[PDB]
């Protein structure tokens, strides 16, 4: 009995592992399986991760973009059986965790407020192709 939580964690096996690291303050696009009529699309959603809300499994994260003049925000269960892929598309200096502040002034300002994590970025490309060397060769 003593592990009422560990018990919960056992119900968890619906959890994914493939999906990549990505922390708030850096853009990324998720591929979402969608039901157009009856068949199934794979609508993409590219935008900035506005807030990651950690809670082990069922931790969620939220993306923000501006399709056609209107700003739009989506939320995804980090372990949803409906996220085909999720490619990171750029990384930036956060300096904060939850960052809804980007809402009330997005533009040339939103840029020069999340420059580029040339730190993490270099870990990206480097350990990216590097670890690829050790599986190519």
């Amino acid at each position: 009995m003593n592990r009422g939580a560990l018990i919960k964690l056992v119900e968890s096996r619906y959890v994914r592992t493939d999906l990549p690291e990505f922390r708030p303050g850096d853009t990324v696009r998720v591929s979402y399986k969608v039901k157009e009529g009856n068949r199934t699309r794979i609508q993409d959603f590219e935008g900035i991760v506005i807030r990651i809300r950690r809670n082990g499994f069922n931790t969620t994260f939220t993306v923000r973009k501006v399709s056609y003049g209107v700003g739009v925000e989506r939320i995804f269960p980090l372990h949803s059986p409906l996220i085909q892929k999720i490619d990171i598309v750029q990384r930036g200096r956060a300096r904060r965790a939850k960052l809804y502040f980007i809402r009330n002034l997005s533009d040339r300002e939103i840029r020069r407020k999340l420059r580029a994590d040339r730190k993490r970025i270099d870990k990206d490309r480097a350990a990216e192709r590097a670890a690829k060397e050790e599986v190519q060769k």
Binding site: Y68, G71, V72
Partner: protein, 122 residues
């Protein structure tokens, strides 16, 4: 979630730029209305010589909302504004081409015209 007195943004060339909600047209006493719902509304401001005038009492359908809507698959979605498209009493969109994204719920609700005319459907 829209309710009476709420100002919507008009998402089409209806001619109208803004309308206030008069009645949420669900049940006999619905508190609010979200995407896919229809509402009676007043044209509180509108473009010159447009197809619709200020004070025109009209029906429309919510297509974008500040309060997030929950998809059955656990996902959610919200827009930066509350928007709606003015419609026929036949429930067909008066003005032609609409602009700004729209919610997928309109699909399940049977507004093919608008989801068609949509620049994008999130």
């Amino acid at each position: 979630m829209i309710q009476p007195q709420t100002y919507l943004e008009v998402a089409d060339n209806t001619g109208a730029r803004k309308i206030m909600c008069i009645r949420v047209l669900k049940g006999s006493n619905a508190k609010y209305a979200t995407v896919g719902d229809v509402i009676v509304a007043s044209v509180k401001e509108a473009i010159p010589r447009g197809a619709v005038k200020e004070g025109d009492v009209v029906k429309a359908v919510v297509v974008r909302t500040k309060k997030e809507v929950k998809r059955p698959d656990g996902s959610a979605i919200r827009f930066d504004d509350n928007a709606a498209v003015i419609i026929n009493n036949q429930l067909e969109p008066r003005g032609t081409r609409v602009f700004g994204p729209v919610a997928r719920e309109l699909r399940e609700k049977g507004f093919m015209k608008i989801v068609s005319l949509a620049p994008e459907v999130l």
